[PDB]
Amino acid sequence: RTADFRTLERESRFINPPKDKSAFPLLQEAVQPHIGSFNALTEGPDGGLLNLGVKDIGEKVIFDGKPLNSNSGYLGNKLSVSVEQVSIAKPMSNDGVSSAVERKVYPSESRQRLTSYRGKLLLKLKWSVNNGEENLFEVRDCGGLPVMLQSNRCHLNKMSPYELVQHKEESDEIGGYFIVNGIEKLIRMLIVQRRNHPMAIIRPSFANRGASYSHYGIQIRSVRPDQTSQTNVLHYLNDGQVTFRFSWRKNEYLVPVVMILKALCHTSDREIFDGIIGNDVKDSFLTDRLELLLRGFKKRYPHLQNRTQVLQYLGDKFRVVFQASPDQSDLEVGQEVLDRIVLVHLGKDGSQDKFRMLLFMIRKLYSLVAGECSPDNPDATQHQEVLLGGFLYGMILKEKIDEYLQNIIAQVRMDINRGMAINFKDKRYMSRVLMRVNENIGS
Amino acid sequence: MIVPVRCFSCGKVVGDKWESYLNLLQEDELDEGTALSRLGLKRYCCRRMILTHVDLIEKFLRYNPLEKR
Amino acid sequence: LREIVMTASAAIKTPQMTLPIWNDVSDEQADTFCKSISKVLLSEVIDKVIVTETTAARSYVIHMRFFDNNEYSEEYDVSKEELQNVISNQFIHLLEAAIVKEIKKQK
Amino acid sequence: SEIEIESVQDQPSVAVGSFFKGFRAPSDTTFDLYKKKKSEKDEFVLHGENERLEYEGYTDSSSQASNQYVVGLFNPEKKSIQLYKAPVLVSKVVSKSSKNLRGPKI
Amino acid sequence: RQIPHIDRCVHPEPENGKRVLVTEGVNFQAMWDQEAFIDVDGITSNDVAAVLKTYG
Amino acid sequence: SVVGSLIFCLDCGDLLENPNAVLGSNVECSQCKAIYPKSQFSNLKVVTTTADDAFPSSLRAKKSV
Amino acid sequence: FSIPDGFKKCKHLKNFPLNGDNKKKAKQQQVWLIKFPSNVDISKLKSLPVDFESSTTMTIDKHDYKIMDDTDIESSLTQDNLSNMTLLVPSESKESLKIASTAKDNAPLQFDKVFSVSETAKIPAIDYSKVRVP
Amino acid sequence: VRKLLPESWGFLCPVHTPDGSPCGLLNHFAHKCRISTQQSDVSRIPSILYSLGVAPASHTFAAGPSLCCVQIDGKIIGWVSHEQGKIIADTLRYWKVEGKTPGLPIDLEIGYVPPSTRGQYPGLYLFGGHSRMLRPVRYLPLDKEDIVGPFEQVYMNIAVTPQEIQNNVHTHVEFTPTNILSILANLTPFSDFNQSPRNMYQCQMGKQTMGTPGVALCHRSDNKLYRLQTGQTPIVKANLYDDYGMDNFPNGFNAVVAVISYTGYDMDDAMIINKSADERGFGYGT
Amino acid sequence: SSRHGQKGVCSRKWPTIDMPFSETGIQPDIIINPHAFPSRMTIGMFVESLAGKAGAL
Amino acid sequence: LRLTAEGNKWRTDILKTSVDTGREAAAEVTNLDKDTPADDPELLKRLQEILRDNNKSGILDAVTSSKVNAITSQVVSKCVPDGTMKKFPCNSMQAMALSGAKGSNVNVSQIMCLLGQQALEGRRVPVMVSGKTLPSFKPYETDAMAGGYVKGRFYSGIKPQEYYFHC
Amino acid sequence: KVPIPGVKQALEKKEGLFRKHMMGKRVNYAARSVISPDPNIETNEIGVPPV
Amino acid sequence: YQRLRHMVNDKFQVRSTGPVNSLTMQPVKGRKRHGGIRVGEMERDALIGHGTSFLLQ
RNA sequence: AUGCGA
Ligand SMILES: [Zn+2]
Ligand SMILES: [Zn+2]
């Protein structure tokens, strides 16, 4: 009597399956990290991860070259396109189109038919004209997004075993996978750097970036509420210079860290010094490297005298690449860059908090350089977290809606660059443009 | 799938002894050992045949596509 | 085996040369010779280096506090006179060249 | 051995201000106090100006709401403290040179 | 003190053969001056190229 | 303020141009306008040292146990 | 300026008897800074066990507390004025705050003692005899 | 990268690993591991920390390896002494296992990193966000469950069983050491009696085993299925065989085995079956 | 394969008459060579044999 | 596979001696006086100095390894052929290794005596940066087991802390 | 972006038409099968299944 | 005991005649294509080792 | 090409 057979209990469960709660709650809890992950893209805080993502993509502005005959360099042609909400519907199929009675579509059907198990993806498009002169809402259907089984978007999410058997399913079907063309696929979980925490790494690639690079460096993987990531690296140059690495359009970019410091918040050099060394006034090692950093920045850019000028230099120097154009001034492009690159885990208006953390990363980097602390291990489980398949889903969706809006803007650019036949105000134009880009993101 | 007809190792027909064995575990509140002793499965090849069985057919049969549900 | 057969590399990773020592060669003589051939870097004898940079030229007072004379004399079989010759001839010339190189780095 | 408390003053009077290491300001520099009577508590704001710069300081409301600063003056001989609630204000100093900008584009 | 190409001379325990000293570097010409302790006729090395250049 | 070999503007906290390089007997801040090469002049010195790592050796190993 | 309309001007201040019992370097007076969780009502105190020097544990509404006192951070016996924890002294309800001092030396003053009220916690010991059953 | 690290204890299985190229790359979560899918109560944590003696980062004005940095999700909220670092970490763990601090979710991960000579850089890095790997262990001071993540575990003394609890050292104990094994590794009986790589080849065989894939097979249309009809429940099993219900999907059969070289066809890796047994349907599959 | 990762192909389908029979009147289902265990150290399989035998009886 | 009551008596009695071996070697490589307390603060600081150095840690591993391997050699040489519950012929497990049909005296000692010291890339168990080789081990544990020496055997099983090292 | 290979790519690398179809080839009159033991055949023979 | 899905017994294949790739006229690939097993480079080396040059041809 | 059997 230690592992006794559950014989009558089992055979009873085989003959008369549970009608209220599956047994073996570990069996459902084992795939909980998948299903739960997919539920967080449709329900949760604010509206779920996906609605935060579309709230973070913001706007895509385009100016029809508002002729008007400031009206010749201020155009007077603003078109702000965005996405307010994103809705996902449970699988349905209506035949002959509309004029039919709709039926719920079950996984058994997708498997028997050897087809995907799609849910209609809808997203509330916002067509804002002249910054507010005219607002247009449109719910656009973006094709069938494959829904995860037993998730908050599959009909089997809440079915009792008895109902599950009544729907031709494995009385215990865990789910968490996708029926795509009838083939069951799951998204493999991945081990990625632990978010939001500076990891001190010595890497010979860091020396491989070029001259004056040391091995030492800091890597923080900032992840936004919507779970999209942005890796930020600090490098200690052999010269004492510290450079800040980031990646945009999967291209890498280096900026002096003292620039992102003077750019985040208005401060004195003595405020950065106190931020870094503090009470530690006795580190000749750190006092001198920091004198090289601050004095060196004062050397390169003697005319960046205040934070605003610095912001203008960053927006002005990246305006060609952040695709924000005349639609923004170099101050706006600069601040939008800061908010979009530097420690995005701290969020908008976290620029003092981003300042404090960035100084903490510089200090950690000098503690690594001196050798007063050990380096961390990227491959230790200590320093790692798990990218859940559903989260990859939300990130790739966010990117697809960003591209979809980029495609609208491209379509307006082509139409206006070959005809300029019609104004941003026409509802006809909304239907026409929307009908000329491809919106089947489900496919 | 379904209670085997015979014990693989020995050869004694066992397929007749399933339902009574299950009755003996329910109705008589017996224990699996004594139930198998009263069934005459006095060898472990036989003992294990019925003792370990998993009559999965009851789970299969609820999937019968030839009747409305 | 790859380092030999595959590449015939003229740069072994661990190049060694075996030296047979005469039957007459004492074990103590052998340890003396082992010290006598091994390289001794200047770093290997330095205990502490204090640089007091004062700046109205930019003054660098470089203080090299070595081990005890007998300490490096019993680990590396070298004298204070050899330290004089090496510092006064080699070390300074190389550091002064590196400082000039750092001026080029400045400009 | 414990120090006794003599008096407590609960209404705004004295303030405390964080600055750069070296702040000294003119022999006459003046500090404007503000009181944004917001619901339960009054988040404060300090503002001053000088011949070149202007210094503005404010409270970290999310840390202010979870911790509150008190300053008192003790006499060893009278064993008495005059207690004063004082806001700690993280102040930044902008100059006249810090108020110039470039064109809105290249 | 540096003999070109030679780093360290160590005193490993003798085994299955004559007493020897194993150096961590290869420089025959330099051991040629040390003949009063080393039977030069019995020098050997793991460096094939250096042997080819010196001993043929 | 002077720290180590850095001297910050006393009024504005800017790391003002080093007194050693001014073209006057009195420099000023690039943020404010304070007088310094003229006032107190500093005697900038740092006792810099080795990290007690650059110099591995058997003798250091005999100093570590 | 008088910005964020959500703010009001000041109208009520109180004189600071900085010198009614001060004497230049002769009165050993002190000013202290103490950090108080909002959960405590300072006005409901009567004395302060700051005199405990280090063992400044304190009990406020049957709650047990520890008062951390530190010299560091701003009273270091190392540098001249290691603090940016400026004292801003008023004068009248119709005057703006002033930099603390003890005479007209354009020199800021520090807090003689800095204290911090820290919330204590039960942290009960492990019952080894109950847990380590074989 | 493939080296099995001790950090993975309780999070990744030490035996659920493929054999070949992927070895060490394709880990498997422990049967008791969880993944955070939300984030909570980060907003109330600053208030309690401030009450516990954390100096506000605007007010602290100090930074260094000489001081503990309290951070929440990579938001530096304050600074304290390393001593107060440890007092905060432990009293915080007490308020976590207690039920009196609703701004403090049980599943918060409290990363304490003590001061260490050339060690990991000190601090009190709390984490509450998603994708954290979290596992239950039994907290002894309240004899109640506590969720620990892989970051804090490194510096935590978790006794493996109650009788090995060392005085004044282990602050938690495993609920069961099976919590460090994956599902299939627990399904393997007496897995602690075999050479490790034989247990790993056991995971690959049982994982490659022809069994019962489902029971709705008349309503699937796989390119291939292998379904054993004569399936049985092991006499010898882990209790997780019942707790995970694997008896719903039996993958084998109980055979009378003689460990005997006798026939001359059982060498190295080859085994003999009874003919009459196969004729009676033994291991019969479709 | 057993639950011990000791996999083997069936070399032959031995006649029941040719199998060895115990004094209990049975002939085994499977015969595994003993010399496989000394390299693998699959002694968990030995214990599973003696536990399944006890538990069947 | 069984030993006698005698063979288990010798096996357990010899295996009682590794408890000194762990710290005794830790204080040899640390270069501190004999019987130095397992909780001397200087011992812990010296051992952290060793942890931060890969070479010094290599010396500590190699010396602890040689000593506990000397305990293994003792255990097998005492038990094994003399202490088995049934001998030679009467013992097929010994027969296969000794004839060399299959197995080795190493395998036979791993079943009947002890597993012994696990190694990786040529040395003892990895240690976390906290100074711990497993969560259950206090930082810098000088116990031989904490380095990965498994006293348990396949015939009587291995403790879970030991299963993680043999894994 | 995945440009159709030319004759230089067709001839070289792992394949090298020379390596994949010249230095080694598929062959006729050949079979592949899982091997099974048998002590009753000669040590110089191979038991061929009647297929 | 568990039955592995890999009945590699069934994976046997023999080809004495079949299709050939048009670019080589050599046996096509794959069991299901009735393709022919590869005599690889190492098997070529081995046949040269044996002196079996008429077998290698 | 991915996974995988030997
Ligand atoms: Zn039978
Ligand atoms: Zn200035």
Swiss-Prot record, chain B:
<dbReference type="GO" id="GO:0008270">
    <property type="term" value="F:zinc ion binding"/>
</dbReference>
<dbReference type="GO" id="GO:0003677">
    <property type="term" value="F:DNA binding"/>
</dbReference>
<dbReference type="GO" id="GO:0042254">
    <property type="term" value="P:ribosome biogenesis"/>
</dbReference>
<dbReference type="GO" id="GO:0006360">
    <property type="term" value="P:transcription by RNA polymerase I"/>
</dbReference>
<comment type="subunit">
    <text>Component of the RNA polymerase I (Pol I), RNA polymerase II (Pol II) and RNA polymerase III (Pol III) complexes. Component of the RNA polymerase I (Pol I) complex consisting of 14 subunits: RPA135, RPA190, RPC40, RPA14, RPB5, RPO26, RPA43, RPB8, RPA12, RPB10, RPC19, RPC10, RPA49 and RPA34. The complex is composed of a horseshoe-shaped core containing ten subunits (RPA135, RPA190, RPB5, RPO26, RPB8, RPB10, RPC10, RPA12, RPC19 and RPC40) where RPA135 and RPA190 form the DNA-binding cleft.</text>
</comment>
<dbReference type="GO" id="GO:0006384">
    <property type="term" value="P:transcription initiation at RNA polymerase III promoter"/>
</dbReference>
<dbReference type="Pfam" id="PF01194">
    <property type="entry name" value="RNA_pol_N"/>
</dbReference>
<dbReference type="GO" id="GO:0042797">
    <property type="term" value="P:tRNA transcription by RNA polymerase III"/>
</dbReference>
<dbReference type="GO" id="GO:0006367">
    <property type="term" value="P:transcription initiation at RNA polymerase II promoter"/>
</dbReference>
<protein>
    <recommendedName>
        <fullName>DNA-directed RNA polymerases I, II, and III subunit RPABC5</fullName>
    </recommendedName>
</protein>
<feature type="binding site">
    <location>
        <position position="10"/>
    </location>
    <ligand>
        <name>Zn(2+)</name>
    </ligand>
</feature>
<keyword id="KW-0690">Ribosome biogenesis</keyword>
UniProtKB/Swiss-Prot annotation, chain D:
<comment type="subunit">
    <text>Component of the RNA polymerase I (Pol I) complex consisting of 14 subunits: RPA135, RPA190, RPC40, RPA14, RPB5, RPO26, RPA43, RPB8, RPA12, RPB10, RPC19, RPC10, RPA49 and RPA34. The complex is composed of a horseshoe-shaped core containing ten subunits (RPA135, RPA190, RPB5, RPO26, RPB8, RPB10, RPC10, RPA12, RPC19 and RPC40) where RPA135 and RPA190 form the DNA-binding cleft. Outside of the core, RPA14 and RPA43 form the stalk that mediates interactions with transcription initiation factors and newly synthesized RNA.</text>
</comment>
<protein>
    <recommendedName>
        <fullName>DNA-directed RNA polymerase I subunit RPA49</fullName>
    </recommendedName>
</protein>
<feature type="modified residue" description="Phosphoserine">
    <location>
        <position position="27"/>
    </location>
</feature>
<comment type="similarity">
    <text>Belongs to the eukaryotic RPA49/POLR1E RNA polymerase subunit family.</text>
</comment>
<comment type="function">
    <text>DNA-dependent RNA polymerases catalyze the transcription of DNA into RNA using the four ribonucleoside triphosphates as substrates. Component of RNA polymerase I (Pol I) which synthesizes ribosomal RNA precursors. Besides, RNA polymerase I has intrinsic RNA cleavage activity. The heterodimer formed by RPA34 and RPA49 stimulates transcript elongation by Pol I. Subunit RPA49 can bind both single-stranded and double-stranded DNA.</text>
</comment>
UniProtKB/Swiss-Prot annotation, chain E:
<comment type="subunit">
    <text>Component of the RNA polymerase I (Pol I) complex consisting of 14 subunits: RPA135, RPA190, RPC40, RPA14, RPB5, RPO26, RPA43, RPB8, RPA12, RPB10, RPC19, RPC10, RPA49 and RPA34. The complex is composed of a horseshoe-shaped core containing ten subunits (RPA135, RPA190, RPB5, RPO26, RPB8, RPB10, RPC10, RPA12, RPC19 and RPC40) where RPA135 and RPA190 form the DNA-binding cleft. Outside of the core, RPA14 and RPA43 form the stalk that mediates interactions with transcription initiation factors and newly synthesized RNA.</text>
</comment>
<comment type="similarity">
    <text>Belongs to the RNA polymerase beta' chain family.</text>
</comment>
<protein>
    <recommendedName>
        <fullName>DNA-directed RNA polymerase I subunit RPA190</fullName>
    </recommendedName>
</protein>
<comment type="function">
    <text>DNA-dependent RNA polymerases catalyze the transcription of DNA into RNA using the four ribonucleoside triphosphates as substrates. Component of RNA polymerase I (Pol I) which synthesizes ribosomal RNA precursors. Besides, RNA polymerase I has intrinsic RNA cleavage activity. RPA190 and RPA135 both contribute to the polymerase catalytic activity and together form the Pol I active center. In addition, subunit RPA12 contributes a catalytic zinc ribbon that is required for RNA cleavage by Pol I.</text>
</comment>
UniProtKB/Swiss-Prot annotation, chain I:
<comment type="subunit">
    <text>Component of the RNA polymerase I (Pol I) complex consisting of 14 subunits: RPA135, RPA190, RPC40, RPA14, RPB5, RPO26, RPA43, RPB8, RPA12, RPB10, RPC19, RPC10, RPA49 and RPA34. The complex is composed of a horseshoe-shaped core containing ten subunits (RPA135, RPA190, RPB5, RPO26, RPB8, RPB10, RPC10, RPA12, RPC19 and RPC40) where RPA135 and RPA190 form the DNA-binding cleft. Outside of the core, RPA14 and RPA43 form the stalk that mediates interactions with transcription initiation factors and newly synthesized RNA.</text>
</comment>
<comment type="function">
    <text>DNA-dependent RNA polymerases catalyze the transcription of DNA into RNA using the four ribonucleoside triphosphates as substrates. Component of RNA polymerase I (Pol I) which synthesizes ribosomal RNA precursors. Besides, RNA polymerase I has intrinsic RNA cleavage activity. RPA190 and RPA135 both contribute to the polymerase catalytic activity and together form the Pol I active center. In addition, subunit RPA12 contributes a catalytic zinc ribbon that is required for RNA cleavage by Pol I.</text>
</comment>
<comment type="similarity">
    <text>Belongs to the RNA polymerase beta chain family.</text>
</comment>
<protein>
    <recommendedName>
        <fullName>DNA-directed RNA polymerase I subunit RPA135</fullName>
    </recommendedName>
</protein>
